Design an enzyme around this catalytic site. Structure first.
Site, short mmCIF file in Angstrom:
data_model
loop_
_atom_site.label_atom_id
_atom_site.label_comp_id
_atom_site.label_asym_id
_atom_site.label_seq_id
_atom_site.Cartn_x
_atom_site.Cartn_y
_atom_site.Cartn_z
N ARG A 8 -4.82 4.84 -2.61
CA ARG A 8 -4.22 4.49 -3.90
C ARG A 8 -2.74 4.26 -3.65
O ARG A 8 -2.02 5.14 -3.15
CB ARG A 8 -4.50 5.59 -4.95
CG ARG A 8 -4.05 5.31 -6.39
CD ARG A 8 -4.77 4.08 -6.87
NE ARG A 8 -6.20 4.31 -6.98
CZ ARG A 8 -7.08 3.41 -7.41
NH1 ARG A 8 -6.68 2.16 -7.62
NH2 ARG A 8 -8.35 3.76 -7.61
N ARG A 9 -2.29 3.07 -3.95
CA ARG A 9 -0.95 2.71 -3.51
C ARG A 9 0.11 3.66 -4.08
O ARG A 9 1.11 3.93 -3.40
CB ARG A 9 -0.67 1.27 -3.88
CG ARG A 9 -0.93 0.93 -5.30
CD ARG A 9 -0.49 -0.52 -5.58
NE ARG A 9 -0.54 -0.86 -7.00
CZ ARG A 9 -0.14 -2.03 -7.50
NH1 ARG A 9 0.33 -2.98 -6.70
NH2 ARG A 9 -0.23 -2.26 -8.81
N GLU A 38 -5.50 -7.92 -1.47
CA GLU A 38 -5.95 -7.35 -2.74
C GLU A 38 -5.40 -8.19 -3.90
O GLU A 38 -4.58 -7.75 -4.70
CB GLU A 38 -5.52 -5.90 -2.84
CG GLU A 38 -6.21 -5.07 -1.75
CD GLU A 38 -5.74 -3.64 -1.69
OE1 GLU A 38 -4.53 -3.43 -1.93
OE2 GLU A 38 -6.53 -2.70 -1.41
N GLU A 81 -13.60 -1.43 -2.43
CA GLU A 81 -13.61 -1.11 -1.00
C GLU A 81 -14.63 -0.03 -0.70
O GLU A 81 -15.37 -0.12 0.30
CB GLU A 81 -12.18 -0.70 -0.56
CG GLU A 81 -11.27 -1.92 -0.58
CD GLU A 81 -9.76 -1.71 -0.76
OE1 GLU A 81 -9.28 -0.55 -0.57
OE2 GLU A 81 -9.07 -2.72 -1.06
#
Length: 139
Positions: A8-9, A38, A81
């Site tokens: 999770r960025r 993405e 993903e």
């Protein structure tokens, strides 16, 4: 590359970078520039990247799966993903870094199985020993 790291960025990016660094220093190839894929424009290349790596390392930082909740249409990139990794029978290695485990029923059915893969707890105190444990889990 041998390894795809999903994270999770906004909470897992620093650990993801540390893993990319240390896995490569230990001789495992890792997908590096994944974020640019993405985007709807490059979705096919993103899916193909997960499918191409034997190992799927999933960074479970705090709240990392929250954006997957109620994502029935699989628009979230982490959700996509994970579904791709599960669909291909990839070696999945969750890395636990402050994650609060939810009840499976709050997650989409097509990814609840991710919660059944034995995870590795991250430790900053023993970073290197933890990297060696992760490598022992890689295929």
């Amino acid at each position: 590359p041998d390894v795809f790291i999903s994270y999770r960025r906004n909470s897992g990016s620093q650990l993801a970078s540390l893993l990319k660094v240390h896995l490569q220093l230990h001789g495992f190839s890792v997908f590096i520039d994944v974020e640019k894929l993405e985007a709807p424009k490059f979705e096919d290349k993103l899916i193909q990247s997960v499918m191409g790596a034997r190992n799927f390392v999933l960074v479970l930082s705090p709240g990392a799966l929250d954006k997957c909740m109620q994502d029935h249409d699989c628009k979230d990139w982490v959700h996509k993903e994970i579904v791709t990794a599960l669909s291909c029978g990839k070696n999945i290695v969750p890395i636990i870094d402050g994650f609060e485990w939810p009840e499976p029923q709050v997650l989409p059915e097509d990814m609840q199985a991710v919660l059944t893969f034995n995870g590795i707890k991250w430790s900053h105190e023993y970073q290197e020993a933890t990297i060696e444990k992760i490598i022992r889990f890689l295929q």
